[PDB]
Amino acid sequence: QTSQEILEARTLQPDDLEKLLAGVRHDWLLQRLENTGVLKSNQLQQAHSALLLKYSKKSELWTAQETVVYLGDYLKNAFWVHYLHQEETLGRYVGKEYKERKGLRHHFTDVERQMTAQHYVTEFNKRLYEQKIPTQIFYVPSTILLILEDRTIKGCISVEPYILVKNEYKATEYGLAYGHFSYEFSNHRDVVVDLQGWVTGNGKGLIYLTDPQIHSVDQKDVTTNFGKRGIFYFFNNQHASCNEICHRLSLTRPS
Amino acid sequence: MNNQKVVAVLLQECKQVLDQLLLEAPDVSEEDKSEDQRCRALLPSELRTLIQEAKEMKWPFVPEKKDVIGAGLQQLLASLRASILARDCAAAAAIVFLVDRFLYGLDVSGKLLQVAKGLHKLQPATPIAPQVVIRQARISVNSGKLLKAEYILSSLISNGTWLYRNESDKVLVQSVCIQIRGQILQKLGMWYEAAELIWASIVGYLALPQPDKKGLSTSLGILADIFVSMSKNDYEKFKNNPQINLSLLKEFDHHLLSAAEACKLAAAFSAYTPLFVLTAVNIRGTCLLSYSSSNDCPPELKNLHLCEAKEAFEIGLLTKRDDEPVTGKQELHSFVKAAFGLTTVHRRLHGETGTVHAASQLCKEAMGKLYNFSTSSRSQDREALSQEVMSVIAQVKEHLQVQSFSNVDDRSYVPESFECRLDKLIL
Numbered sequence A: 001q002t003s004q005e006i007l008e009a010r011t012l013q014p015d016d017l018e019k020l021l022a023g024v025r026h027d028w029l030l031q032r033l034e035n036t037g038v039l040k041s042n043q044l045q046q047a048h049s050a051l052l053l054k055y056s057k058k059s060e061l062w063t064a065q066e067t068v069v070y071l072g073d074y075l076k077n078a079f080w081v082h083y084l085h086q087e088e089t090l091g092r093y094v095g096k097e098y099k100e101r102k103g104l105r106h107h108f109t110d111v112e113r114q115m116t117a118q119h120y121v122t123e124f125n126k127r128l129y130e131q132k133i134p135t136q137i138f139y140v141p142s143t144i145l146l147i148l149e150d151r152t153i154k155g156c157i158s159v160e161p162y163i164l165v166k167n168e169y170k171a172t173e174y175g176l177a178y179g180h181f182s183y184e185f186s187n188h189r190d191v192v193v194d195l196q197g198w199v200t201g202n203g204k205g206l207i208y209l210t211d212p213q214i215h216s217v218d219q220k221d222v223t224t225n226f227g228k229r230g231i232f233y234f235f236n237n238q239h240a241s242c243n244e245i246c247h248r249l250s251l252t253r254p255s
Numbered sequence B: 001m002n003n004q005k006v007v008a009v010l011l012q013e014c015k016q017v018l019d020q021l022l023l024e025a026p027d028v029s030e031e032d033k034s035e036d037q038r039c040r041a042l043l044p045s046e047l048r049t050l051i052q053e054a055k056e057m058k059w060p061f062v063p064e065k066k067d068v069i070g071a072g073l074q075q076l077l078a079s080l081r082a083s084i085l086a087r088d089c090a091a092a093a094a095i096v097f098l099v100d101r102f103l104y105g106l107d108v109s110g111k112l113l114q115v116a117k118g119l120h121k122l123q124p125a126t127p128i129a130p131q132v133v134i135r136q137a138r139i140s141v142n143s144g145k146l147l148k149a150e151y152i153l154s155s156l157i158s159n160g161t162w163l164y165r166n167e168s169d170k171v172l173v174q175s176v177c178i179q180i181r182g183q184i185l186q187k188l189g190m191w192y193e194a195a196e197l198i199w200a201s202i203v204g205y206l207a208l209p210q211p212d213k214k215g216l217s218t219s220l221g222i223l224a225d226i227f228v229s230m231s232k233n234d235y236e237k238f239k240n241n242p243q244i245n246l247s248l249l250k251e252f253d254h255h256l257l258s259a260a261e262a263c264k265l266a267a268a269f270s271a272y273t274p275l276f277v278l279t280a281v282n283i284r285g286t287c288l289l290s291y292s293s294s295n296d297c298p299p300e301l302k303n304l305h306l307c308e309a310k311e312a313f314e315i316g317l318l319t320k321r322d323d324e325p326v327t328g329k330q331e332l333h334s335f336v337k338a339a340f341g342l343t344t345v346h347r348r349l350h351g352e353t354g355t356v357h358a359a360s361q362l363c364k365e366a367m368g369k370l371y372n373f374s375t376s377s378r379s380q381d382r383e384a385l386s387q388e389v390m391s392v393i394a395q396v397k398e399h400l401q402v403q404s405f406s407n408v409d410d411r412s413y414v415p416e417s418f419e420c421r422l423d424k425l426i427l
């Protein structure tokens, strides 16, 4: 690409911005930002214009909203952020710069996997509630902020909320039952595991999902995925048996 | 006055009512019955009638009609502590009832409810107001203990008793309870059934001899958010449901538009409380920004909905007169959000003009001062920075020609167009 082709890639024309605000296919977004290059780091202790990008697993569309983000200090590399559309307006949020040389498409694919994991958390938590189990798995995917100057993409930060004897069931039993549930609720195509192992909880009925990994029969995009091997290893080494939650949610053994 | 003080004094209240449960042998003292008389008489002849009304169960929720509580909070807390040492649990539970709503705003309901639990355990005969029972459902919901909150609400609706000299009072409690049940289903993502429960809460509020406008406002705002999260199939089912007869549903054909209409009604039913006007119209402006840029908006109608978004954000900015104090972080953020929403509408209508950029720059400046506000501790700062972001907000209204609207009601923060409601809600 020439210098002009990079200038065209980082500049959202009004037609581009109009597609983004209406909702845009995942394939279209990956194509449109693949050859962007590395975006410089954003100035801290400063407010910036941004596009908030949200992916919807139901519609399979990315939708942009204009917002304003303040980037604060480095946390004693993560920095504090506050933006006008943040879910918990009284909460604190943490941003990281995305400057991996493998490309922006890896970051958007990562957030699509997180929405897929979050979709299964939502459905799992509904099943726990319906069966009168007083616990919820807590999980919130990162959000993407595209820092704009005018229509020019200047930066990309990932934002996450700052989150840092209950008995009946242990956190691991909830976590493995969630993985079993994700396998049934996806019609035997996905299994979601935590790479951190359900070590953490809180003073409540919250078990935290920290690092989801989706073993899937499908492959789409360039995400690293253990696929069918991962699913068999899950049902034969991690969830070999089944627990009381599996039974209360009426989960059955597969193969 | 201060959050940390109230907590420390409410925690002792509990720890001592815990001791009276064990130690027992009600051996009071003449100094105890004096100091109770001591602290109750200091109460301004005003709070004392309130304690009496609450003592004798005049309502299940304290009427709003407070600065009374905020001023006499320290006195209330001393009299509460002394009423407990004198084993006068009815007066203590009346005081708990009266400070409950104000202390929810102080984020100390947890400690207050521990006092309420301690009074009930000391003598189960004590009334305990529905508002205080419902309060423990509210902080359970806020905590994600959704099952526990449902159990609380269930036990309130049926089963050591409080009673109502009225039949409407019983349906008002059930309506608030049903409202929170709707918010529970909303937390879980069950949008359709959440909306059915929120609808039931609205029917109830409308069935009262004097309709509860506060309840209608907050239920309409919850209904608005549920419409935003709804699938188009969720909304179609709700819309064609023969048991729902809401004008929002029949008058509009898109869940974002019904959401914006529900927010307009929420703001109007709250027309005297400027903070919930601002909150409601910001959600209205956001819905119309979303709708007007979606592929569902007729191209010839795009400008019209953007001007409706324009109007909404403007009403929000107009909820505060120029040099007038603003205290909380939520309201500060909401104000910055309305200014950038207005700027965004101009951007969507007219592109990146000189006045759009200048306004955008003003929003960034206010964003900086707002983050400085949210990371401060000394009160002088929070008061001084809040002034600074409100100073910038005033700059934004002047810069974008925010025209005040005139309404016949001197103290309504909502234009006359908004106020067509009540009989027009259910048709």
Ligand SMILES: Nc1ncnc2c1ncn2[C@@H]1O[C@H](COP(=O)(O)OP(=O)(O)O[C@@H]2O[C@H]([C@H](O)CO)[C@@H](O)[C@H](O)[C@@H]2O)[C@@H](O)[C@H]1O
Binding pocket: B061, B101, B104, B131, B134, B176, B179, B212, B213, B214, B215, B216, B217, B218, B219, B221, B269, B270, B276
């Ligand atoms: N107009 C509004 N719009 C949006 N949100 C609002 C509005 N007003 C208050 N809120 C917020 O709702 C939460 C609970 O507000 P409260 O602490 O006052 O509840 P409380 O039990 O003491 O009073 C009862 O409230 C009922 C309301 O339906 C709330 O259930 C009335 O139906 C009863 O007549 C009785 O007044 C709190 O976050 C508050 O900021």
Ligand SMILES: [Zn+2]
Binding pocket: A177, A180, A239, A241, A242, A243, A246, A251
């Ligand atoms: Zn299992």
